[PDB]
Symmetry: D2
């Protein structure tokens, strides 16, 4: 599993469950092409987005639909979504964990990259 | 000044100086129309981006060129840029400050909305 | 003003107003000697804590009463307080800003050290 | 395992390995009594600090020795340590994960609390 995402809720102190996200990859004509999508599980994790063979070098974008998450809790948040954009596998295959910590008016994102 | 940006550097504990950013407004065709841009000052701040008359309700994207900032310091970063996408809504008088705290493999962004 | 504190609220996207804090300096017997205190202003800031003459090298602790802040808003928090412990070292002229970003189950703290 | 700690390094995008920490519990005479200690593993995690029977209601403090971590990497950081203080098990037994994301001049801490 070369690309995993983990989402936490800073207001409830819990994993952020059922958060939708879409992954895009920048194509040669400079447009974002759909690559994968899913929702976080009861542990706030989304696994199995791609495989090592499919996850080639490129620029990738992960859009995390945080607005729908907060709205379903009755909160009207600041951000439309959290956006994480990065170059992947530029120096060979790696495993990427993208983490996001969510509050209504603030979020953080970090990456753990292992070889 | 209805919209200001502040950028900080969590590695050196200083304002992030000379950071370039563009602001976009979402159009009817779901494309990003460039709206404003600048570089942060010696205090890590960017003012004068828009006016009250021009800053109408809509979805806005602030794209912060964090990769060039870290490259200038000789540090290999994870993200291509830091992206802040938000819905601007007229709920009374409101001035927006977007803050971003930068590390090579992590960033946080917060909004302070005051009257 | 060699030492200032700024406190923000990540749930409401506003300065954290009326937050109490104490500052301690570590003594020779490893006890915490109270040094200064105050409450944050309408801008979420606390100034005037110390002077250059008094703010000597040493280890300092800023203890921010975040629990009472969330309790006043009717929100059950995780932390008893937010604690910032740091070594102050004379490396040229230096003014310290301690920032803290608060959520019910999470906090971040940053230092901006400038000349 | 009712108390686990996870530490990440925001500069290298990796778990923070070999980070020491000490856990204290506030005694009836208002002093901090030693409770448990350990170092994070190759995955940045510290497990097996306590058991459900030993981990009674009380106020607990986790001191994470971040200064020694950065110093061993050649960085001179701002903070002496990261301090997390909280009331545990006030409404019955819970499982606590304390997470810390570290940069030289900034850190965040979050708690995931499950039943
Ligand atoms: O608005 C201000 C003003 C001064 C400072 Cl120093 C930090 C912030 C915001 C901020 C604080 C923290 Cl603790 C983390 C990330 C942030 O953007
Ligand atoms: O990956 C995990 C798994 C469990 C937990 Cl509890 C926190 C993180 C990362 C994290 C920590 C902090 Cl302190 C802030 C934002 C984060 O994504
Ligand atoms: Ca309206
Ligand atoms: Ca000295």
């Amino acid at each position: 599993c070369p690309l995993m995402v983990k989402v936490l809720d800073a207001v409830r102190g819990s994993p952020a469950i059922n958060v939708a996200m879409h992954v895009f990859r920048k194509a040669a004509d400079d447009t974002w092409e759909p690559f994968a999508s899913g929702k976080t599980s009861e542990s706030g994790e989304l696994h199995g987005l791609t495989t090592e063979e499919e996850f080639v070098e490129g620029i990738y974008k992960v859009e995390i639909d945080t607005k729908s998450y907060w709205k379903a809790l009755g909160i009207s948040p600041f951000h439309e979504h959290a956006e994480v954009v990065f170059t992947a596998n530029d120096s060979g295959p790696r495993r990427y964990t993208i983490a996001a910590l969510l509050s209504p008016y603030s979020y953080s994102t970090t990456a753990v990259v292992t070889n």
